[PDB]
Amino acid sequence: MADLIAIITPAHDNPFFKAEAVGAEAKAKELGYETLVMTHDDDANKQSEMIDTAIGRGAKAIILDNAGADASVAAVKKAKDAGIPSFLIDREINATGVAVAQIVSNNYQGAQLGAQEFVKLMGEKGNYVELVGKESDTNAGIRSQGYHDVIDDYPEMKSVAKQSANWSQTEAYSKMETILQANPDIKGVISGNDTMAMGAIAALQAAGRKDVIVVGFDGSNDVRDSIKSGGIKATVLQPAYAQAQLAVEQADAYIKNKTTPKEEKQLMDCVLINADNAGKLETFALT
Numbered sequence: 001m002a003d004l005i006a007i008i009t010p011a012h013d014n015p016f017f018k019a020e021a022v023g024a025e026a027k028a029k030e031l032g033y034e035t036l037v038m039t040h041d042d043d044a045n046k047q048s049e050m051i052d053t054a055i056g057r058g059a060k061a062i063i064l065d066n067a068g069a070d071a072s073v074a075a076v077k078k079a080k081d082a083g084i085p086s087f088l089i090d091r092e093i094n095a096t097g098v099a100v101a102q103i104v105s106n107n108y109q110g111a112q113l114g115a116q117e118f119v120k121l122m123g124e125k126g127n128y129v130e131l132v133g134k135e136s137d138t139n140a141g142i143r144s145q146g147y148h149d150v151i152d153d154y155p156e157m158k159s160v161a162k163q164s165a166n167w168s169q170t171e172a173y174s175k176m177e178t179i180l181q182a183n184p185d186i187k188g189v190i191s192g193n194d195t196m197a198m199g200a201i202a203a204l205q206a207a208g209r210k211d212v213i214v215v216g217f218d219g220s221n222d223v224r225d226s227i228k229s230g231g232i233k234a235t236v237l238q239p240a241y242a243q244a245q246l247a248v249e250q251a252d253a254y255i256k257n258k259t260t261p262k263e264e265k266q267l268m269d270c271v272l273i274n275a276d277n278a279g280k281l282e283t284f285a286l287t
């Protein structure tokens with residue numbers, strides 16, 4: 001009897017994606033839907049399998065945080081041709097008019113906020129390293145660009161390594177160990193996301209370099225807690241919970257009478273998190 005909404009994200013070991021799934025699930029059930037929550041583990045084939053499952057089960061809409069900007073177009077198009085609309089969150093696909101919605105953070109704006117804080121904490125000088133996200137995710141390059149466009153105004157600041165750790169805490173730890181051995185004179189690390197920042201601060205701490213300034217991106221409870229404890233200095237909040245709920249609200253409107261948002265692509269504002277507002281943050285929302 002109940003209509004079904006399928007929710008598909010990357011693995012829940014990154015709290016960002018878990019929070020999206022829980023937010024979407026909550027809104028779906030609040031509006032009378034049953035839910036089917038699946039993970040694709042950043043694997044396009046697994047994402048294909050999961051969308052087939054949504055189709056097979058008769059989902060009325062799919063909420064998707066995708067497995068690659070290019071690779072995901074065909075999957076979303078498969079669902080579409082099966083008569084099932086997709087409402088994308090967090091990550092864009094490199095196509096318009098396929099998804100009904102793409103509701104993402106303003107990544108360039110956000111990244112600039114975090115870089116501005118990084119520069120301030122750095123006193124406009126010194127050697128730093130950058131950890132970059134997954135090449136398949138347009139968010140990785142957009143954030144890097146925003147960071148670069150701030151930091152390139154400060155000639156005394158110098159990047160001594162720029163490496164991908166693929167949005168992975170464990171990869172970030174290992175990369176940081178190697179980077180730190182090559183570059184003992186680093187003053188700071190700026191990271192494209194919070195799981196990489198957690199890996200970095202762990203590696204720094206284990207090397208006895210607690211003085212190094214780390215700035216992340218996402219606003220997770222884990223990084224909040226680090227900020228509160230004097231670890232990481234700042235992050236940038238993406239409204240993950242609200243974004244997932246908005247996607248479901250749009251899906252429900254569409255299911256009900258084919259209301260579509262005026263603009264497919266929608267941006268949500270980011271907010272800088274630091275010691276002054278970390279205590280107002282919980283599960284990707286400020287109060």
Ligand SMILES: O[C@@H]1[C@H](O)[C@H](O)CO[C@H]1O
Nearest residue numbers: 016090137139167193218
């Ligand atoms: O926006 C998300 C989050 O930053 C996550 O932590 C990594 O993937 C990005 O696309």
Ligand SMILES: [Ca+2]
Nearest residue numbers: 149150152153
């Ligand atoms: Ca500039």
Ligand SMILES: [Cl-]
Nearest residue numbers: 068069070071
């Ligand atoms: Cl891709």
